[PDB]
Design a protein around this ligand. Structure first.
Ligand code: HEM
Length: 152
């Protein structure tokens, strides 16, 4: 649960991402894959990437980063009223991709890391607080659907 002022902060931060969605999306995925190499094994289309240079050169990885962040932005713009947008993603991630909730924690922390890396000194304590709460709400509502499905 976020206040209006907290949502305002989230959507202000999100404007930074929307100026360069592919570059942000690329860096989020590279931070996830290099920091948590087990996550790469869930992607049949990325498991061939052995080095970060290959990851950086991969146009398909940047494309998937765009898909991911576009979906997340659509959810965030709902300011918590996201049941219809979140349900299919929870279902695909539990039943088809088999992504444990732990990896959603990993990508959440990776988003924070990338924001500080690309906007140093311009991602303030209030903005980090509100963005963190929004990612927690997203993860928690996914977790409820995972529990319904019995997925661990
Ligand atoms: C911010 C959280 C994330 C968002 C919003 C997101 C969004 C998406 C979307 C929109 C798709 C395509 C449609 C679908 O299959 O449902 C996708 C595919 C996928 N997601 Fe996620 N995702 C997230 C986190 C993750 C994480 C943590 C992993 C793995 C570590 C992951 C693994 C995948 C895989 C395996 C695919 C299929 C790729 C394909 O083969 O083309 N997702 N995701």
């Amino acid at each position: 649960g976020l206040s209006d002022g907290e949502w305002q902060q989230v959507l202000n931060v999100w404007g930074k991402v929307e100026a360069d969605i592919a570059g942000h999306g690329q860096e989020v995925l590279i931070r996830l894959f290099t920091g948590h190499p087990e996550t790469l094994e869930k992607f049949d289309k990325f498991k061939h990437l052995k080095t970060e240079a290959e990851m950086k050169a991969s146009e398909d990885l940047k494309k998937h980063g765009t898909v991911v962040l576009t979906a997340l932005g659509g959810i965030l713009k709902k300011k918590g009223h996201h049941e219809a947008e979140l349900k299919p993603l929870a279902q695909s991630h539990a039943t088809k991709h088999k992504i444990p909730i732990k990896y959603l924690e990993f990508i959440s922390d990776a988003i924070i890391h990338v924001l500080h890396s690309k906007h140093p000194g311009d991602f303030g304590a209030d903005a980090q607080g509100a963005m963190t709460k929004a990612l927690e709400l997203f993860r928690n509502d996914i977790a409820a659907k995972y529990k319904e499905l019995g997925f661990q």
